[PDB]
Amino acid sequence: RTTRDDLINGNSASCADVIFIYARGSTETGNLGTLGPSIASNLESAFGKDGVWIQGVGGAYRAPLGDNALPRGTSSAAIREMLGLFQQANTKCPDATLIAGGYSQGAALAAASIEDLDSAIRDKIAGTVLFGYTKNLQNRGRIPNYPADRTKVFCNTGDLVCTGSLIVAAPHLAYGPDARGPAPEFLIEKVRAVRGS
């Protein structure tokens, strides 16, 4: 449901083939918030429960609304937390394919993290989905240092954070259908593109 720590809890001797690391939006609960669980269930349907590990960014990432105003759109402590989880995945399960996602502040966090990541680990993230991407305009719809073909941004018309503002309007809260269909669809496709099946 809203907390999944499959990577932290996972046995190194029986690594999943796919590891998904997801950062929730501001003020959301657990470490998956409102959108994460929907994505998780569909990935589990595609890869099987033992086939994918779902890991939300918890720990120091408290997702405070105020941190949207910081330079990178989230705090340094939150970035360190997510970097730490990619590095844990890379160490625990060197052969797993990674996928990532974030909503709102979590999308800025995912983008900042991936930008700072060691390239060898960044290169293992086969696809990333961003919903209500707060740095969409500033970054021109891209994640720095990460390929456009592995990136999918869901930015609703009228969601002001996609257009350089930090105002929360009703479209910002309307990503439910995307998390249920096109976002897991994209992620599954990108994993299969490199792993076959």
One-letter amino acid of 4: R
**Rounded-to-integer distance, Cα 148 and Cα 79, Å:** 21
**Rounded-to-integer distance, Cα 131 and Cα 96, Å:** 24
Q: Which domain range does residue 176 map to?
A: 1-197
Question: Of 26, 67, 113, 159, which residue is the catalytic one?
Answer: 159
Which residues does residue 132 pair with via DSSP β-bridges, in sequence order?
none
Q: Supply the CATH number for residue 115's domain.
A: 3.40.50.1820
* Catalytic-residue membership of 159: yes
Ramachandran category for residue 131: left, alpha or beta (phi over 0 → left; psi -120 to 50 → alpha): beta
The token pair at 161 is 């954070």
**Rounded-to-integer distance, Cα 17 and Cα 21, Å:** 13
Question: Of 26, 38, 75, 172, which residue is the catalytic one?
Answer: 172
Domain tally for the chain?
A: 1
* Catalytic-residue membership of 113: no
Question: Of 38, 75, 104, 113, which residue is the catalytic one?
Answer: 104
Method used experimentally: X-ray
* Catalytic-residue membership of 6: no
